[PDB]
């Protein structure tokens, strides 16, 4: 029974929940296990970045996130095609490739080509045998580093372009933003009917002739 003021509150402890309580006494033991396993995987992939493969830059979806930029899942085929890396090979040099990515705008594409180009510059492809054929880099850039790269490879940093102080032309000052927005709202709202009434009026003008 409720007594004088309080949130009329609904707890969800009506099922047999104590049968399915999940404690976290693992977690330290877990955290270590991951960490060992992590250090092992590094050591196995000896001069290769611990990170993984290189991954594309990509914008988030939705109005909310929109402005931010992450690492994506893998580079698109167009981006590999333009960079000039054979897709089947790109996997073998540590370049993530997804093939389900569309590519809508050319601003996101050229950026991601630039990424791969830069990667290919600062990559040290070892030759297959110790005897050195084409592609494989010099023994200088090899002895000076068979070094792993700690952290994510060529990390993405969401960055801003500084706008210098303008002078405010008599035109910026002239603008009526709030009004403009109200107008722009109503024209989206009313576009469709306006077009139907105009289509009606056009039919009335043609009907007047016959």
């Amino acid at each position: 029974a409720p007594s004088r003021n309080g949130m009329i509150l609904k707890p969800h402890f009506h099922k047999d929940w104590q049968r399915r309580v999940a404690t976290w006494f693992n977690q330290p033991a877990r955290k270590i296990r991951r960490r060992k396993a992590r250090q092992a995987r590094a050591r196995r992939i000896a001069p290769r970045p611990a990170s993984g493969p290189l991954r594309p830059i990509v914008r988030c979806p939705t109005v909310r996130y929109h402005t931010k930029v992450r690492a994506g899942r893998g580079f698109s085929l167009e981006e590999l095609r333009v960079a000039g890396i054979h897709k089947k090979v790109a996997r073998t040099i540590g370049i993530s490739v997804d093939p389900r990515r569309r590519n809508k705008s050319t601003e996101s594409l050229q950026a991601n080509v630039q990424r791969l180009k830069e990667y290919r510059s600062k990559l040290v492809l070892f030759p297959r045998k110790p005897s050195a054929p084409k592609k494989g880099d010099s023994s200088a850039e090899e002895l000076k580093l068979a070094t792993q790269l700690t952290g994510p490879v060529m990390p993405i940093r969401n960055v801003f372009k500084k706008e210098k102080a303008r002078v405010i032309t008599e035109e910026e000052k002239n603008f009526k933003a709030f009004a403009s927005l109200r107008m722009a709202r109503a024209n989206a709202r009313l576009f469709g009917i306006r077009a139907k009434r105009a289509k009606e009026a056009a039919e009335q003008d043609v009907e007047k002739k016959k």
Partner: peptide
């Protein structure tokens, strides 16, 4: 269901 009806009870 199993996932959704676990009291995860953290440390």
């Amino acid at each position: 269901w199993r996932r959704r009806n676990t009291l995860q009870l953290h440390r």
